[PDB]
Design a protein around this ligand. Sequence first.
Ligand code: MB9
Ligand code: CL
Lengths: 9, 271
Amino acid sequence: RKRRRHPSG
Amino acid sequence: PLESQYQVGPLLGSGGFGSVYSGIRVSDNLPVAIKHVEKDRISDWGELPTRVPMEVVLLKKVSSGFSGVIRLLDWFERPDSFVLILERPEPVQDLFDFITERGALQEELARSFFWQVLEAVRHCHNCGVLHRDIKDENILIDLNRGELKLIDFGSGALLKDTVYTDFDGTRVYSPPEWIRYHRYHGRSAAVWSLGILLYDMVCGDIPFEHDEEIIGGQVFFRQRVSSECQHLIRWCLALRPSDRPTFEEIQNHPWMQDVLLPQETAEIHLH
Ligand SMILES: Cn1c2c(c3ccc(Cl)cc31)[C@@H](C#N)C1(CCNCC1)NC2=O
Ligand SMILES: [Cl-]
């Protein structure tokens, strides 16, 4: 299962 | 004059905000981070007792010897940007990368980290600052000291007791009342993001990716987690903002008892 960052905004 | 006083090194990160570089203050070789914030992407502006990004106002307000929050050392204005000089721990890893590499954290480690984040956020609130972007990407681990540092005040506001109707933090850490109504109170929204963060620590990723999950009210545990920890998480992630704990109630929760010291944390888990 893919873990990712999430940019702000 | 900026360019004379800091030796610039490698790019450390970039995105919507701008770009941040590794640096050394030439004066005394102090490790710094040099953060370039483009004027075009600055939404909120404040005033120091000139016109600056709100980020600079909030950083000045939380600035202190207390190491739980990043220290702004200096700042410069250029034609099309601001340059922020931040203290840089060495060696350092952000909490996002730490969790990616290590997976789901042992509860003892998660307790130590989460406690330190609580103390950092309480510091901000005591100084009149609401962070609005609490997440693992915005937490640095001083690997030698076992001390965590809250960074990235680029979405923050002055703390107030009335509703916020603006938000530019991270959506997956944002509360259901924001998703549904575009309205939230600062503290209860903060506690929601801390719930997300704690789940992230003990399960190895955040619980929700989609709006429907955020508002749905079910917390599924994908990892083996103690009942006491589940209880705290689910309390922080109460759908109704008034059902969420205060910071005091979080730190008095039975899961939060007998926290490791930062130095013990480094010895047992980081060194
Ligand atoms: C690697 N890095 C970053 C930041 C850092 C701040 C200080 C230090 Cl010593 C390192 C930093 C943030 C910025 N700019 C942010 C800004 C955006 N959200 C994550 C933190 N981006 C980074 O890449
Ligand atoms: Cl930052």
